[PDB]
Amino acid sequence: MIGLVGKKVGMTRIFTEDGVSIPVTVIEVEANRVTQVKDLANDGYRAIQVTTGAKKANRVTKPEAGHFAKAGVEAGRGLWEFRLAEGEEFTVGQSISVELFADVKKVDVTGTSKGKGFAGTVKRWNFRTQDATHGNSLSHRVPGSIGQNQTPGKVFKGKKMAGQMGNERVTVQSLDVVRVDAERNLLLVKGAVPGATGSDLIVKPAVKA
Amino acid sequence: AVQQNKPTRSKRGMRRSHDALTAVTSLSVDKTSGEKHLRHHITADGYYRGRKVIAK
Amino acid sequence: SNIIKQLEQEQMKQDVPSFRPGDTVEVKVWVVEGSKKRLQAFEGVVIAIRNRGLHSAFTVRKISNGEGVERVFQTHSPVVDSISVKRRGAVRKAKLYYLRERTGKAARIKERLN
Amino acid sequence: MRHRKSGRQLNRNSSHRQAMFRNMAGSLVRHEIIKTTLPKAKELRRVVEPLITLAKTDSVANRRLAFARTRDNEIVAKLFNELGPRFASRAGGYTRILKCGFRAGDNAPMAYIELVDR
Amino acid sequence: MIQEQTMLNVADNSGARRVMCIKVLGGSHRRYAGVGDIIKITIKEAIPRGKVKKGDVLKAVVVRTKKGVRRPDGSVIRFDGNACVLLNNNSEQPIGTRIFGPVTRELRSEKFMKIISLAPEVL
RNA sequence: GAGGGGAGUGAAAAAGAACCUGAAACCGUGUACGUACAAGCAGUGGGAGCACGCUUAGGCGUGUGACUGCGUACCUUUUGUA
RNA sequence: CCGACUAAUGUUGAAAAAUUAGCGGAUGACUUGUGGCUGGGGGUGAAAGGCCAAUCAAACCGGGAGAUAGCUGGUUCUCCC
RNA sequence: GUCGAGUCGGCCUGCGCGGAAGAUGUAACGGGGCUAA
RNA sequence: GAAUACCAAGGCGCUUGAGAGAACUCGGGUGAAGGAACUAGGCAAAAUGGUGCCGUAACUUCGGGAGAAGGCACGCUGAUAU
RNA sequence: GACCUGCACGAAUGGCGUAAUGAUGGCCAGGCUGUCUCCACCCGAGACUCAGUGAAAUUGAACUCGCUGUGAAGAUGCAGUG
RNA sequence: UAACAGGCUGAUACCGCCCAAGAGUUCAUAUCGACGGCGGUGUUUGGCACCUCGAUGUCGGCUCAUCACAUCCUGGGGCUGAAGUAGGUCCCAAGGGUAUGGCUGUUCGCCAUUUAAAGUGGUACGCGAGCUGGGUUUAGAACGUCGUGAGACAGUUCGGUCCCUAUCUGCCGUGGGCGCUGGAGAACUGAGGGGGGCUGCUCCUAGUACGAGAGGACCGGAGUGGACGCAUCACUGGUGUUCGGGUUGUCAUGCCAAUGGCACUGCCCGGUAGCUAAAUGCGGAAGAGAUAAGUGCUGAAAGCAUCUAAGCACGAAACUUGCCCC
RNA sequence: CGACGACGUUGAUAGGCCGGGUGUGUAAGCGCAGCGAUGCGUUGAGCUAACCGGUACUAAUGAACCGUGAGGCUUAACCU
Ligand SMILES: [Mg+2]
Ligand SMILES: [Mg+2]
Ligand SMILES: [Mg+2]
Ligand SMILES: [Mg+2]
Ligand SMILES: [Mg+2]
Ligand SMILES: [Mg+2]
Ligand SMILES: [Mg+2]
Ligand SMILES: [Mg+2]
Ligand SMILES: [Mg+2]
Ligand SMILES: [Mg+2]
Ligand SMILES: [Mg+2]
Ligand SMILES: [Mg+2]
Ligand SMILES: [Mg+2]
Ligand SMILES: [Mg+2]
Ligand SMILES: [Mg+2]
Ligand SMILES: [Mg+2]
Ligand SMILES: [Mg+2]
Ligand SMILES: [Mg+2]
Ligand SMILES: [Mg+2]
Ligand SMILES: [Mg+2]
Ligand SMILES: [Mg+2]
Ligand SMILES: [Mg+2]
Ligand SMILES: [Mg+2]
Ligand SMILES: [Mg+2]
Ligand SMILES: [Mg+2]
Ligand SMILES: [Mg+2]
Ligand SMILES: [Mg+2]
Ligand SMILES: [Mg+2]
Ligand SMILES: [Mg+2]
Ligand SMILES: [Mg+2]
Ligand SMILES: [Mg+2]
Ligand SMILES: [Mg+2]
Ligand SMILES: [Mg+2]
Ligand SMILES: [Mg+2]
Ligand SMILES: [Mg+2]
Ligand SMILES: [Mg+2]
Ligand SMILES: [Mg+2]
Ligand SMILES: [Mg+2]
Ligand SMILES: [Mg+2]
Ligand SMILES: [Mg+2]
Ligand SMILES: [Mg+2]
Ligand SMILES: [Mg+2]
Ligand SMILES: [Mg+2]
Ligand SMILES: [Mg+2]
Ligand SMILES: [Mg+2]
Ligand SMILES: [Mg+2]
Ligand SMILES: [Mg+2]
Ligand SMILES: [Mg+2]
Ligand SMILES: [Mg+2]
Ligand SMILES: [Mg+2]
Ligand SMILES: [Mg+2]
Ligand SMILES: [Mg+2]
Ligand SMILES: [Mg+2]
Ligand SMILES: [Mg+2]
Ligand SMILES: [Mg+2]
Ligand SMILES: [Mg+2]
Ligand SMILES: [Mg+2]
Ligand SMILES: [Mg+2]
Ligand SMILES: [Mg+2]
Ligand SMILES: [Mg+2]
Ligand SMILES: [Mg+2]
Ligand SMILES: [Mg+2]
Ligand SMILES: [Mg+2]
Ligand SMILES: [Mg+2]
Ligand SMILES: [Mg+2]
Ligand SMILES: [Mg+2]
Ligand SMILES: [Mg+2]
Ligand SMILES: [Mg+2]
Ligand SMILES: [Mg+2]
Ligand SMILES: [Mg+2]
Ligand SMILES: [Mg+2]
C-alpha cells in the first residue's frame, strides 16, 4: 500500500473518556500530488512519485519546474516515491489526501533523526564508563581496549567507536493511528516519531500489521 | 608514538595537496565611489552601497 | 503552533476554579473497582502548580493514615471530576517543597484573608 | 550539542561577558558609532536595543532599571533624554552593523556598529 | 524504585521495623522493584516479641515508594518513604494481621487482595 | 627601512663586502613523458604509446615507461636471517 | 614559619621533585640570618649506607694513562688461482 | 505341499565407505576447475 | 586574629590574539530513586565545622579519656535603660 | 573472643600487661554522599577553525591492504587467494 | 644459556571410539561398564632450547571484545528401565541469550540469594603506546627460621614513582579530487554490505489426555513482564553560572531610598527553552524457500524385506529471504 | 572543520520590535498603620533567556566569478 508525505507538527495528548492520556505525534498531511507514474515497461518497476507543500517560484530551477509542468501540478517542496502494490493504480496529477489512512489501524513513520554530532562511545553505543576515582588516569569515558594482540593484529571492521550520531533515516514501526482528520489535514499517531518539529515524515501502512 | 620510517617528499606533497589558498572570486564595485571592496564590507574610503558611511 | 493549540483547546476543561499554592483543595477523582465507578476525595495543600495549557498540573500533599503522600494531578484529565478550594493559604513562594521537611505545627500555613 | 540555544560565550565567563557588554553598550550610546569584532557587535545588538526600547518610556522606575544595567547616569540620561525620543517611532532595529575587514594584530573580523540615525 | 541494599519500612504488624532488599526477584539482571513487586529481604530491625526475628530471610511486596506510581492519565502518586509487607517465603501471603498506612490500587490482584482488604486506605 | 632594480668602477660584481673556487645532502620554478580499478625491497628482462632531435630518409639517438616474466635491502653475527 | 601523610594534575613539565585540594609541628630535642670548623677509607650521621655543591657501598679535578678488556663492534680500491 | 534358474556363506585380493570435533576467512589439490584434468 | 571576605594608600590584568560551542582530557556546579551495592581499601567525594549554656560512658598512670557522645539558643526592632 | 595440636613464642638481641599519644596496621557501625546501580545536564581551561610564531622523540630505503599457508619457527613486503 | 609468551612434541591431560566380564529382578549394550585395545585435540602437567637478553611488560580486576563447538539456556529429533509431570542418554543445531553479592590481591573456590540458563575453550594463559596496581619482583623495617657473620627464606609482616603530542597498517566518522564520454537539476533500480534475531510468568484449551491416587500435559491460543535496542520530550522528572526571588559580609553609585561589583553562580529557593532517564512509544515476529538430525511414501537390485538405487513427501532459533539502515 | 538544510528586498533568514505564553511571586514610587523592625493598599504587581503567533525597524547590494556554443569511431535496426 502506498504512503503519504507529511510534516512533524509536534506532540500533544488525547484524553479519553475513561481517563487514559494517549501521547500523540501530530502529523500534517497535506494533499500529495502525483508527479510521475513509473511502470514496468518504461522504468522496470511500478511506483508513483509525489510532491506536497509548496516552494517559492524563484527557488524552483528550470529542470524541476519542467518536471512539475509535465505533470500539470504546482511545485511542492520535494519529491518522494512509493512502490505500488498489485491492485494499486494512480494517474499523473492525481491528488492523494490523508483520508487514505481512514481505515488503517497502524502506520510506520520514517524521518531523519535529530543530530547529535560527534558522539562518544558512552553516548553512541552505551559503553560503560570506567572508574571515576580509584586511581583512573585520564580514562573515564574512553573506549578501553579496541582489540586483541598480535593475533589478529588489527581492529575488526564494524568496531563500535566514537563518531557521527543521528541525522539519519529512522523508521518506527506499527504506531497506532489515533485519529485521521481529513478537514484539517492531520494524522495523529500514538507515540514518538523520528526527527525535530517541522521536519518531513514518511507515513505508510504498517508492514508488520 | 613516532614514525618507524622517514616519510618521503612525495608523501609530504600529497598531504599538502589540500593546502592551497583560495583567492577571492570577485571584488565588488561601489556604485558611487567606484572603488573596489570586499562584498558586504565597506570600502577603504568609508563607502558602502553608495553611501558615505564613515568619514575621515 | 496554531494547529496543536487548536487540538489542545478543544480538550480543555472550562470550569477549573482559581487556586494558588498553599491553598487547601479537595480533588474528586474517579476510581473504578470492577464495573463500579465512584468518586474518591483527595484533600491537601497545593505545593506546586504547573501552568501549561492542556498539560497543566498541580501537586497536592497530605498526611494520610500516618504517611505523607503527594499526588500530581493532570488538571484537564477526565480522571479529575471536580476541584474545590477548602481554604485559602497565604504563602510567598510558588513551590512549597520546604513543607516536605515540616510536620504538625511547623507545617501550618496562614490563611489568606481576602 | 547547542540546539535552539542563544547567546555567545565568547571564550569568557558570564560575569566577564556581562561587564564587557555593559561597558560596550555605554560606549555605543556615548559615541553612537564604535568598531568591534563582528560577533561582539552582533551580540551587542541584543543588549543595546532593549535599553533604547526601555528608554522610550520615561519614568523613575525605568531610569532605575536602565541604571542597574549600564551603571552610568550619563548613559541613562542620554538614553531617556535623547535616544528614546529619537527612536520613539522606530519599531526595533536602532543599530546598524557595517563589516569593515580584518584586524591587523590578530586577523579578527571587524565591524562598525552605529545608531541608525547617527 | 527498590534495589539491592535498599532499606524499607514495614507496613504490617509482623514485628519487623526495618528490612533490606537483598534481591529483586523475577528476572535476570532485573534492576528495580516497584509497588506491587515482590522482593527478597533480610530483617535488620524487629520488635522484641513479634512473629519475625532480626536476620530472618523472607519475601516482601513493595506497597509504597518515594518514586511512586504513574496512572493512565499521566498523574503520579508519591510517598514520603518506601515500605513493604512481609510475605511467607513459600506461600507469599502476609505474615501480619494488620496493614498500616495507605496503599495503592496497583495491589488489586488475586495475590494481594488481603492487603487491600486490611489497608486503611487504597489510593 | 630591510631588500631589490638600474647607473657607475673593475678583467670579472653569476668578485658587492651574507664577497676566490662554490661539490653533496636538502628545497624550489620551468618543460617532456607517465600517473586517479590499482596491491609488496620499487629494480631487472621484455615492451607499446608520446615528445624532442638526427648528414643517406631511413630507421636511429635522448627522455618517459602503459602492459607483462622474474624478483623479501645492506652490514654484522650465526647451524641458519626478508 | 618549619615540614611533607593522601589524592589529582604534570611526566619532550610552568618545575631535572613542582602545583592544587586536603595534612603534621607550631615556646621547642623549635625555627632562621651572618660568619666559623670537621675532607675522602676521610668527615658528618636521633642510623636511611643517609649526606658531603642536581655526583656517593668510597666526592670532584688533574696525573700513572693509550690500566687491562681470552669480550662486543668496526676494519676503506681491483682482478686471477 | 506350493514358483522355475540359480542359491548360499566362508577365504584371498584391487579400489572405495564410515570411524573423522577448533578456534580472524574458503583455508587438508597453490588457485580455477576436473568424473578425468 | 598578622585567619578570612570586601576595600584604602599604592600596585597590577600575568607579551599571542580572534572565533566556535563536537568526542575526549583537565578544574568545578547540580542531580530523580537507591545509599558503599564501588573497590585491594569509602581511594576520591560528600559530610562535620562557631560561641554560650545544659549534658557526657567504659577505662585511667587520677592529669586524663572529653570538644566524649547528645542537645538547646543565635537575625532584626522596641522597652527595661531618650 | 576462645581452644593449644607453639611446623618454628618466651623473659633486658627482654616476657606479659598498660591509661595517654599516632598523617601507624587490621575490623565494624551511624552520618554522608555520582564510589557505584548508571549515568544526565551545566560553568569554565584545552581539544576544533582563522591569523602570527614555531618544537620533539624517531627515521636502511618504501609504490607501507585482508586472509590461509610458508618461513630464523607469531609476515604490509614470500606463495595462493580475497 | 634459564624465568614470560610463541614454536616443535603430545609422555601426561582432556575428549571420542573398539572388545564386552559384570551391574542392571530377568536382560552385556535404558543407564553404567572390569581386564585390555585404537584414536582425536593442542587443552593441563611436562620435554626441548628454535625466536627475542643493543628489553617481545608476565597475576588479578576494569573497559572493549572476537572466534570455535566438545551446547549452559532456548529450537529440532532417536532410544529409555519414556503412564503423566519431570528425568536419563545420544543425535542435530553456534541465531540470540548466558547473575548480583559476602570472604579473600586473587584466578579459583566456598557461601547467600537469583535466573530460561549462570556453557567449555582459542584469541601473546585476548586486551597496561586503553585504565588499575591489591599480588609477584629493587632499595626501609620486623617476626619465625637458618647462619659465627655479612646475610638468607614460591615463609610471613607494615611501606614502597606505571612515560609516550600516532608517521604507517588497522578501525570509527567526515570532506576534497578526478572519473563515469556535451553540460545540468532531480527521482530511482539494487549488485553488494551491515543491523536485528533472547526469554519468563499468568490465563484459556483443561483439572481435560495420562494416572490407583498424588499429581498433571502435548498440540494451539491470549495477556503481561525481565534484559536488550531504536526513537522521542506529550507526560513525570534532572539540569537549567543566559529568568525571577530570598539572604550574609563588604565596597561603591554624594546621602536616604533604590541599585551594582566581589565573596565557588558568595550562599541559597524556585525555574524557560534545549539536552536528557528514572519518563513513554515502538521492535525481536509471522510468512516463504532450501535443509540438519530424524520421519516417511512408492520401489527394485536381492521373487522377500528395504526411506533410495530411479522417482515422491515432511522436517529446527542454524542457511536463503521476509523486517530496518547503507 | 568541510559537509548538509533554510533564506537574500519579487524577503520572515537572523537580530530587534509588538502581542501572548512561561517562570518568579505582589517591583519602584506614593499613601496609610505602627515608636520601630515591619505590615497593608495601589498589585498577582514588576521583571521575564534559548518558547508561540506576528511584524521589514536593522542586516541579508546592483553586480561580479565559474560553467559554454549541439557533443568521437564502427556496425546494426530503421527515416529517406
Ligand atoms: Mg544536532
Ligand atoms: Mg560501571
Ligand atoms: Mg600519573
Ligand atoms: Mg581524572
Ligand atoms: Mg624496526
Ligand atoms: Mg593541510
Ligand atoms: Mg534560535
Ligand atoms: Mg582562545
Ligand atoms: Mg562572581
Ligand atoms: Mg639600498
Ligand atoms: Mg686569485
Ligand atoms: Mg663564491
Ligand atoms: Mg587508470
Ligand atoms: Mg574492479
Ligand atoms: Mg612476482
Ligand atoms: Mg641462534
Ligand atoms: Mg631466506
Ligand atoms: Mg626532612
Ligand atoms: Mg600544599
Ligand atoms: Mg597534636
Ligand atoms: Mg597547632
Ligand atoms: Mg640496608
Ligand atoms: Mg647530592
Ligand atoms: Mg675503593
Ligand atoms: Mg702504566
Ligand atoms: Mg683504554
Ligand atoms: Mg570456518
Ligand atoms: Mg590574607
Ligand atoms: Mg566545554
Ligand atoms: Mg569532568
Ligand atoms: Mg557537588
Ligand atoms: Mg542522586
Ligand atoms: Mg534525593
Ligand atoms: Mg541512609
Ligand atoms: Mg563490597
Ligand atoms: Mg564487587
Ligand atoms: Mg579521604
Ligand atoms: Mg569536600
Ligand atoms: Mg622474639
Ligand atoms: Mg635471662
Ligand atoms: Mg620491645
Ligand atoms: Mg596556527
Ligand atoms: Mg600500495
Ligand atoms: Mg596479516
Ligand atoms: Mg602468519
Ligand atoms: Mg617457554
Ligand atoms: Mg608448552
Ligand atoms: Mg642443540
Ligand atoms: Mg618470539
Ligand atoms: Mg631492538
Ligand atoms: Mg556438535
Ligand atoms: Mg553462522
Ligand atoms: Mg534466519
Ligand atoms: Mg564471585
Ligand atoms: Mg561490609
Ligand atoms: Mg594475557
Ligand atoms: Mg578468554
Ligand atoms: Mg599508561
Ligand atoms: Mg598493548
Ligand atoms: Mg631490606
Ligand atoms: Mg549481520
Ligand atoms: Mg516542550
Ligand atoms: Mg523540574
Ligand atoms: Mg538552580
Ligand atoms: Mg540571578
Ligand atoms: Mg541604604
Ligand atoms: Mg570591586
Ligand atoms: Mg577584590
Ligand atoms: Mg518390495
Ligand atoms: Mg513580553
Ligand atoms: Mg527586588
Side-chain angles (χ1 to χ4, degrees), chain D residues 41-91:
Chain D
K42 287 185 173 174
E43 280 314 285
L44 180 68
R45 278 178 317 183
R46 299 188 71 225
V47 178
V48 174
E49 290 190 17
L51 281 170
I52 296 172
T53 308
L54 179 70
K56 283 184 184 173
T57 303
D58 192 356
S59 74
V60 172
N62 281 356
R63 280 195 190 233
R64 287 188 183 188
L65 289 174
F67 185 67
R69 312 156 173 176
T70 77
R71 291 297 295 187
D72 193 311
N73 274 313
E74 182 195 270
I75 299 315
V76 169
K78 182 165 187 177
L79 281 168
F80 284 80
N81 298 338
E82 322 176 14
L83 295 188
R86 277 165 60 183
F87 295 118
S89 64
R90 190 176 287 278

Side-chain angles (χ1 to χ4, degrees), chain A residues 128-129 132-133 141 150-151 154:
Chain A
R128 325 158 155 97
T129 62
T133 66
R141 299 174 75 83
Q150 168 162 194
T151 297
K154 67 173 178 178

